[PDB]
Design a protein around this ligand. Structure first.
Ligand SMILES: Nc1ncnc2c1ncn2[C@@H]1O[C@H](COP(=O)(O)CP(=O)(O)OP(=O)(O)O)[C@@H](O)[C@H]1O
Ligand SMILES: [Mg+2]
Ligand SMILES: [Mg+2]
Length: 154
């Protein structure tokens, strides 16, 4: 049946905003995934560009492992098609939450085990998932989010 999940997307190279918008486009077009909500974008502040990050709410009929493959194929797709002969990767797609489930595999940890210490994740996530419970801490997102001045709305 249909599960609600949250993804975190980040990019700090090229047309960063396009990367993010293209990742969302691709994800929305996999079978078993539809994008139901999108956070605003945030910028986070040595000489390489700042990250843009956002969070995405999806409704999916996929298993969390199938969802992981979709995320990685999306990273892979955008990367392969980059102009620049080599360089740092263009896009990170991380699974933040999958229902209220906890998953501990070598290849997969959900909830993302570092989300709670990252404002560039929590702040955008709080814009679309304030009342969702993070099952490890058993706190809601809105109870975890904190102010961080280095994270600005873009
Ligand atoms: N919640 C999650 N979302 C996505 N990948 C995860 C994950 N938990 C574990 N992984 C695994 O970690 C591997 C690492 O890929 P990367 O994207 O380069 C880690 P990262 O996002 O750069 O750092 P981070 O995990 O601290 O954000 C993936 O191939 C995947 O199998
Ligand atoms: Mg990451
Ligand atoms: Mg990752």
């Amino acid at each position: 049946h249909m599960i609600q999940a949250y993804l975190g997307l980040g990019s700090n190279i090229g047309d960063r905003e396009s990367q993010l918008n293209d990742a969302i486009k691709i994800l929305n077009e996999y079978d078993g995934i539809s994008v139901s909500n999108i956070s605003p974008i945030y910028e986070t502040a040595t000489e390489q560009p700042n990250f843009l990050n956002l969070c995405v709410e999806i409704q999916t009929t996929l298993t969390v492992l199938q969802l992981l493959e979709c995320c990685l194929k999306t990273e892979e797709c955008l990367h392969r098609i980059r102009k620049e002969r080599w360089g740092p990767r263009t896009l990170d797609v991380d699974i933040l939450l999958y229902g209220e489930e906890m998953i501990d595999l070598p290849k997969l940890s959900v909830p993302h085990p570092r989300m709670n210490e990252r404002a560039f994740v929590l702040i955008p996530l709080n814009d679309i998932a304030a009342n969702v419970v993070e099952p490890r801490s058993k706190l809601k997102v809105k109870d975890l989010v904190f102010v961080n001045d280095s994270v600005k709305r873009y």
